[PDB]
Design an enzyme around this catalytic site. Structure first.
Site, mmCIF file in Angstrom:
data_model
loop_
_atom_site.group_PDB
_atom_site.id
_atom_site.type_symbol
_atom_site.label_atom_id
_atom_site.label_comp_id
_atom_site.label_asym_id
_atom_site.label_seq_id
_atom_site.Cartn_x
_atom_site.Cartn_y
_atom_site.Cartn_z
ATOM 1 C CD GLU A 94 -9.171 -33.690 5.008
ATOM 2 O OE1 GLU A 94 -10.190 -33.910 5.649
ATOM 3 O OE2 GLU A 94 -8.519 -32.699 5.221
ATOM 4 C CD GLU A 153 -4.231 -32.168 10.323
ATOM 5 O OE1 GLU A 153 -4.099 -32.857 9.287
ATOM 6 O OE2 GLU A 153 -5.356 -31.896 10.818
#
Length: 189
Positions: free
Chosen positions: A85, A176
């Site tokens: 990620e 986010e």
């Protein structure tokens, strides 16, 4: 606002996930535009881009990003085999996500130095299920909410340092947030 999920909108991939807590609205706009408004949210991630991404994409983003609390604005994605990620962080709120991470170099790209870090996530959710995997980070020193990211510069710098990437999965410009408030409106191309 839309349901959480993934799909295509006006020629762009999008992904929108939240933990169910409430307090987040995500809207897809025309073209590469999306908007996020949140107020005492839980954990969420949303944005637009490509499925799959590439290792030499030049990503343009423009808009407004006003976090009040813990939030990031990043180019965000995954690889497979190995499972990684990754984040190229252009802006953040109260928390620098590289806090406590191991610094693995510096790269100059697109008008700023970025610090490079590596972290490990142990038995966490991933695109292939619960797993242990590395996260790679480039954190921009000079924060901004518009610009161009030459992803090749980051990926090549990470490779030089031993941080290799596998086969690309999705690749988006994402907002986010983790239990915070804010507004953003971003156009990708």
């Amino acid at each position: 606002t839309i349901q959480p999920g993934t799909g295509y909108n006006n020629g762009y991939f999008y992904s929108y996930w939240n933990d169910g807590h409430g307090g987040v609205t995500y809207t897809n706009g025309p073209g590469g535009q999306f908007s996020v408004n949140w107020s005492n949210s839980g954990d969420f991630v949303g944005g637009k881009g490509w499925q799959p991404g590439t290792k030499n994409k030049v990503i343009n983003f423009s808009g407004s990003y006003n976090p009040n609390g813990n939030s990031y604005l990043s180019v965000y994605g995954w690889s497979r085999n190995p499972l990684i990620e990754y984040y190229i962080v252009e802006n953040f709120g109260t928390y620098n996500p590289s806090t406590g991470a191991t610094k693995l170099g510096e790269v100059t790209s697109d008008g700023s130095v970025y610090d490079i870090y590596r972290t490990q996530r142990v038995n966490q959710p991933s695109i292939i299920g619960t797993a242990t995997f590395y996260q790679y980070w480039s954190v921009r020193r000079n924060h901004r909410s518009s610009g161009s990211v030459n992803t090749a510069n980051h990926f090549n710098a990470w490779a030089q340092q031993g941080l290799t990437l596998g086969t690309m999965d999705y690749q988006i410009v994402a907002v986010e947030g983790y239990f915070s408030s804010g507004s953003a409106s971003i156009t990708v191309s």
